[PDB]
A paper describes a structure:
The Gag polyprotein, composed of MA, CA, SP1, NC, SP2, and P6 domains, is the sole viral component needed for the assembly and release of an immature virus particle, which is accomplished by the oligomerization of Gag into a lattice structure at the plasma membrane. Cryo-electron tomography (cryo-ET) data has revealed that the immature Gag lattice forms a spherical cage of interconnected hexamers where the CA protein plays a critical role in stabilizing the spherical hexameric lattice before the viral protease cleaves the Gag polyprotein into its individual subunits and maturation occurs. CA is composed of two domains, the N-terminal domain (NTD) and the C-terminal domain (CTD). By contrast, the immature CA hexamer is stabilized by both CTD-CTD and NTD-NTD interactions and adopts a more extended conformation with a six-helix bundle at the base of the CA-SP1 domains, and the immature lattice is stabilized by NTD-NTD interactions that mediate the inter-hexamer contacts.
We utilized the PFO-treated VLPs with either LEN or both BVM and LEN bound, which resulted in a 2.18 Å resolution and a 2.10 Å resolution cryo-EM maps, respectively, with virtually identical GagCA-SP1 conformations (RMSD 0.4 Å). LEN binds the immature GagCA-SP1 lattice in a novel binding pocket consisting of three different CANTD protomers, two from one hexamer (denoted chain #1 and #2) and the other from a neighboring hexamer (denoted chain #3). The largest conformational difference is a ~90-degree rotation of the diazatricyclonona group of LEN when compared to the structure of LEN bound to the mature capsid. This change is likely due to the stacking interaction between the diazatricyclonona group of LEN and residue R18 of chain #3 from a neighboring CA hexamer. In addition, residue R82 on chain #2 of the same hexamer as chain #1 stacks onto the trifluoroethyl group of LEN, leading to a modest shift of its position. However, an ~8° reorientation of the CANTD relative to the CACTD takes place upon LEN binding, which induces an overall conformational change of the CANTD layer in the immature GagCA-SP1 lattice. The change in the GagCA-SP1 lattice is driven by the repositioning of residues to interact directly with LEN. Within an immature CA hexamer, hydrogen bonds are no longer formed between E79/R82 and Q50’/T54’/N57’ upon LEN binding (3d left). Notably, residue R18 mediates the interactions at the juncture of three CANTD protomers and participates in the interaction with LEN, highlighting its key role in LEN binding and lattice dynamics. This residue is engaged in a hydrogen bond across the 2-fold interface with a neighboring E75’ in the LEN-bound structure instead of E76’ in the apo lattice (3d middle). Similarly, R18 forms a new hydrogen bond across the 3-fold interface with Q63’ (LEN-bound) instead of N57’ (apo) (3d middle).
Residue numbers in the entry:
A (entry chain K), B (entry chain O), C (entry chain N), D (entry chain M), E (entry chain J): 11 to 239
The structure:
Amino acid sequence: VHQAISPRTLNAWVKVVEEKAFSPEVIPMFSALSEGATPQDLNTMLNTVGGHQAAMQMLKETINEEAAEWDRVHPVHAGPIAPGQMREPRGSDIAGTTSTLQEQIGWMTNNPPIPVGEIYKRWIILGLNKIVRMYSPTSILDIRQGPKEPFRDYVDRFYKTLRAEQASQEVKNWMTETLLVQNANPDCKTILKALGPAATLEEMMTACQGVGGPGHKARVLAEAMSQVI
Amino acid sequence: VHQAISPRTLNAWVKVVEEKAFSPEVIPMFSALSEGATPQDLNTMLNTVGGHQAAMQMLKETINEEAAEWDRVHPVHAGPIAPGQMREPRGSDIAGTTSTLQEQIGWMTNNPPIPVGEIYKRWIILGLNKIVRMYSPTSILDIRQGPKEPFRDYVDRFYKTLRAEQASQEVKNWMTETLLVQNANPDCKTILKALGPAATLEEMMTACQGVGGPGHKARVLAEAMSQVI
Amino acid sequence: VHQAISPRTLNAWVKVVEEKAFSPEVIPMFSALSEGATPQDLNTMLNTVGGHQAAMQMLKETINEEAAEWDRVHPVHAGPIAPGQMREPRGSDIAGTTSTLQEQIGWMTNNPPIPVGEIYKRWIILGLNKIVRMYSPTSILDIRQGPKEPFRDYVDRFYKTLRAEQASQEVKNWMTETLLVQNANPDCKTILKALGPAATLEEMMTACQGVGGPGHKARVLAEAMSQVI
Amino acid sequence: VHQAISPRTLNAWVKVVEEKAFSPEVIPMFSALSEGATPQDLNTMLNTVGGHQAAMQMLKETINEEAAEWDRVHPVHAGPIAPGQMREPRGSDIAGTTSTLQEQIGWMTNNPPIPVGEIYKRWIILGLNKIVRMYSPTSILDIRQGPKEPFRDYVDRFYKTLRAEQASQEVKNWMTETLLVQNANPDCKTILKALGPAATLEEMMTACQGVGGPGHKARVLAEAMSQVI
Amino acid sequence: VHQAISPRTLNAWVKVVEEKAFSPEVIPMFSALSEGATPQDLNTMLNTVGGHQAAMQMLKETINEEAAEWDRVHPVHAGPIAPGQMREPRGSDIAGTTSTLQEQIGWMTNNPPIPVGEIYKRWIILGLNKIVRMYSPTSILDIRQGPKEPFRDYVDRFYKTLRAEQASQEVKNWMTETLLVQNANPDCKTILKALGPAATLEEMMTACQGVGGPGHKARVLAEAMSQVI
Ligand SMILES: CC(C)(C#Cc1ccc(-c2ccc(Cl)c3c(NS(C)(=O)=O)nn(CC(F)(F)F)c23)c([C@H](Cc2cc(F)cc(F)c2)NC(=O)Cn2nc(C(F)(F)F)c3c2C(F)(F)[C@@H]2C[C@H]32)n1)S(C)(=O)=O
Ligand SMILES: CC(C)(C#Cc1ccc(-c2ccc(Cl)c3c(NS(C)(=O)=O)nn(CC(F)(F)F)c23)c([C@H](Cc2cc(F)cc(F)c2)NC(=O)Cn2nc(C(F)(F)F)c3c2C(F)(F)[C@@H]2C[C@H]32)n1)S(C)(=O)=O
Ligand SMILES: CC(C)(C#Cc1ccc(-c2ccc(Cl)c3c(NS(C)(=O)=O)nn(CC(F)(F)F)c23)c([C@H](Cc2cc(F)cc(F)c2)NC(=O)Cn2nc(C(F)(F)F)c3c2C(F)(F)[C@@H]2C[C@H]32)n1)S(C)(=O)=O
Ligand SMILES: CC(C)(C#Cc1ccc(-c2ccc(Cl)c3c(NS(C)(=O)=O)nn(CC(F)(F)F)c23)c([C@H](Cc2cc(F)cc(F)c2)NC(=O)Cn2nc(C(F)(F)F)c3c2C(F)(F)[C@@H]2C[C@H]32)n1)S(C)(=O)=O
Ligand SMILES: CC(C)(C#Cc1ccc(-c2ccc(Cl)c3c(NS(C)(=O)=O)nn(CC(F)(F)F)c23)c([C@H](Cc2cc(F)cc(F)c2)NC(=O)Cn2nc(C(F)(F)F)c3c2C(F)(F)[C@@H]2C[C@H]32)n1)S(C)(=O)=O
């Protein structure tokens, strides 16, 4: 077909999902970056998304449900296929799983043509709509230690989201240098500030190990009552 | 047709038209959800827009104007229509007013195919383009009583806007109780605050109907003169 | 025809109507950019004028009345058309509404030739003459709030003019930051100045909501009599 | 063709470029305005972009590289062309440079059809995408004079940007009145404010011809030391 | 081909480029994910590198020089090609520019086989090796303002690097919030910290417009001498 994706379109789509993540702007750009492409190019563009595993899982669920709807609307004709004709597509074929490049190209160049690529394109674009409406990406700045949460658990969440985040290694080191102490519970923040800027992660952790325990609660209560008295 | 509308796309279009009102980002979504849809499906999508009657009227005017332009571009050809072929569309025929689903299907799957859905799509896209460019939905946040506006007239305008506003009943009552008094000029706001928080609407109107009259002007003039005397 | 508009001429016309607006200097440029062009190209240039809707409505009225005058001068001959010959153009055909590219080209290359493009050019250029003489574009700097006008109405007028005005978005933001406060009458101007430079639009509108009311009039009268006393 | 652009699509596209400049908002609208339009109409739409010549150059570079890719994937046909069929398109033909309207219509209506318009639309979409990512239009608000920039060079840059600006003439004069003195560096701004608002441009340049010379530096240094002593 | 890449390999390679950027870990992964892959699949994997334009340019230069070497060592076949066999590959064909998928499949299935995919993989390996040794990605952490650099140029470079950065929008906003003032030179940093955290970018640029001018140098020199005296 003459409407296959060029290398520039693939790189543009990759950059689009990189900078714009899954903002609404990803919907029109995709809507123009895969017009007339056979479904395998659409699958290639769907595969080029790095990260956002949950979002693409919702996308896959949407595509599967719409393939089921497609199969519901068009019943499968239980009859022998004429040598001149070829089998009608099913929802999986529109998705591209059970259909090869040759079958898709033949479908889009039939008389009358079946616009398999465009149908899969609509399914994908409304899955993208669902992603934009519901999915919210996890950001390191959204990771703040709770009021009664242990510092080990907060550090585990911080590092899990940092690894899941898409960023450079150097900027990730800067993030774990700054936000780890920045977005911390006030009780742990007092200990972290008292430790000093040269304290390592292990030292900070054994310092906040005692927070929330009976000894720390007794100490802070004693400080409060000394301020009162 | 293989690109017929499906419940998921219709629900998604409804959700984007209610959630996003007529923000510019409604142009991509529509342009991605009606791709390949028959004009009947376009009309079905257009009917589900609740509220925004003014914008809907602008959109209908744009459709009619573009259909007139289409009819002027494509002149009517006389003579008997060939039985193998079928009669050519007009502007209203594209619009679906005088064309049934069978006629639209025949147009979209003929040789050569007349893409009635795509021309419809362009006309509708122009309609929403004008809607977003010019039309601004009336919001209860903007209903504020003018300096000389009677309190009764302001209450009537506020209630009309509330009736036209799309929102749940509970949040509508909350918006009433929190914005009818707040969004008033100081001349009425002072009286309303002096009235007390536990004031019914009838008491509100009765107390504030005296503003702007000779008595209220004389009282406020005397109060102002008290400071200078 | 050899005298169709090149892309550079179209861009030059767009720039002319952009920077020069509808100043008289637009008349000579249109007098030269479109010379010998068939009416289709003339309409194409007449379509790239963003904004100035009222001006082009006057221009359309001029063209329609000149088509009527042209029909008045040359009566329509009620007779069969010779197969070698072709129908003479009516008033609308010179404007290109009832005539396509082929008929316009044939008219412009007849024996004797009918200079349809030049006749339409004369009609259009007199339309621009009327636009230059009478039409005055709405400018933001012409938006000044009246002595006894509510601030909400002034804001509505200011923002309507801002939306209708052509400019960059950053320029529009700077203009609504400066001129909105700058172009208010003494009462609203002193209220805005007392509010402060960081006050939001809602705060300014709330403060000016009371201007012109009985309370504000009593307060300013009290201030004046205190200055007297 | 059935999907030829009507006047209102062209005018709406012109307005889109005028107001939205090259924000991402231009990508969907364009893709929704040229749906099914022949690449001749695509060139017609692209020509009406007033200003932003750098962005148009980037777009033309995109179209050239996409045409190169199209010629790369599609090999040049060899041997005599079948009289029933006609010559295969090339990248320049998709871009509309070499192909005429008749050839493009023949491609669109061929069996099987070659979607020249959609391919060219995707190429222009890629160009617009890189424009919105990278290209940043020059704005008068961003013209600020460097600490060591001579006032003459600052004025030259300011006026060049103002001439390149899309805004109207009267608002351009207003911009000259306010921003030119507002955006000067403190050394020039002190002199300009000492001159008074009545000073003309020539007087202002005369008074800021000396900022950076031995006399001015000596004078400011002496003033600072005298304030110290 | 049997060893055609699967969606998981493409996604894994994309993620490898996203996280590891261009580190020594890229060479092993690329050497194992694209094992036995058709050079068309190699090109698909190469197109997915979002950003790193300079590195990709270096890689393509390496591929071009390797193709030149391949054409140098392998002479061009002369005379007619045997119908049973097929034409020999060239350097561009190994690079995948001129070869089609069918040609590469025939090369790999030929007896004896021509391992086009492995040769292309080695060429890309050389390119990646040069990238990891020499190319260094631009990071906002490494953007700092020179001692004599005006704040406007620093801000422009900072924002250009930020736009080129691979990160999410909220993280980029956080970078703008902190690193823009953190990495300024002390002369600008003193003014920026005296401004306060509430200062906007425009206010910061206005305050720092004067550093390096005669007034600012005189003021700092006077302050230093007064501290001496
Ligand atoms: C060879 C080639 C031409 C191809 C192809 C190719 C072929 C088919 C499919 C596929 C398409 C549609 C359905 Cl409906 C199913 C299905 N239906 S089902 C009953 O649920 O199993 N299964 N498949 C797997 C099948 F068919 F192979 F079995 C599919 C894919 C999808 C494209 C896709 C990616 C995506 F992200 C979200 C989607 F909605 C669709 N990519 C995958 O599936 C692999 N994937 N999945 C997920 C997840 F689940 F998290 F969303 C993730 C990936 C990931 F990319 F790694 C990325 C991290 C995320 N690509 S090429 C050059 O591009 O590599
Ligand atoms: C069978 C079926 C599939 C169908 C169909 C169907 C068929 C035709 C039309 C129609 C279309 C185009 C023209 Cl050009 C005319 C016309 N030309 S004219 C000279 O102006 O009168 N007349 N019609 C009436 C006709 F049909 F009699 F011809 C039309 C509609 C429109 C679709 C539409 C809705 C819309 F909002 C805005 C539009 F631009 C277009 N919807 C209506 O018309 C009813 N409507 N109108 C308006 C208003 F005016 F306020 F915008 C409103 C409605 C509303 F939906 F109630 C909603 C509150 C708003 N739908 S279904 C869904 O029923 O199952
Ligand atoms: C397809 C193509 C070849 C063509 C054509 C084409 C064909 C005809 C016409 C037209 C010409 C003459 C008459 Cl006498 C009438 C008519 N007489 S009547 C009894 O009153 O209805 N009707 N028409 C509509 C018709 F013919 F379609 F029916 C016309 C136009 C005009 C050209 C024009 C533009 C203009 F600004 C002012 C004019 F005086 C004339 N443009 C429009 O009409 C659309 N327009 N109108 C107005 C308004 F009214 F506000 F001024 C506005 C537009 C706008 F551009 F959007 C812009 C905002 C302003 N273009 S192409 C490649 O160029 O796109
Ligand atoms: C007659 C008609 C049917 C037609 C046509 C017509 C035909 C072809 C082309 C064209 C198309 C594709 C390529 Cl790939 C090249 C090419 N490739 S190349 C190797 O560089 O020479 N050259 N062309 C010139 C060609 F064909 F004449 F040779 C083209 C244009 C473009 C449309 C276009 C405009 C644009 F802005 C950006 C684009 F990407 C494409 N318009 C121009 O290019 C003229 N232009 N250029 C530039 C600049 F350089 F700044 F970007 C500028 C203009 C401008 F519009 F003035 C504006 C200020 C900016 N229109 S009609 C009724 O519509 O007028
Ligand atoms: C159809 C398909 C199967 C295919 C294919 C396909 C075919 C060929 C090529 C190609 C291969 C080898 C050479 Cl030696 C040249 C050449 N030699 S030359 C004398 O320099 O012109 N030219 N080409 C362009 C050609 F072939 F079109 F002519 C090539 C590519 C490359 C793959 C590649 C990308 C890359 F980044 C670095 C590489 F080393 C190789 N992709 C491009 O080159 C496009 N690109 N370029 C650059 C730049 F240069 F800026 F770094 C950039 C891109 C980008 F990806 F956008 C990304 C931002 C960076 N892909 S599919 C489904 O995958 O799309």
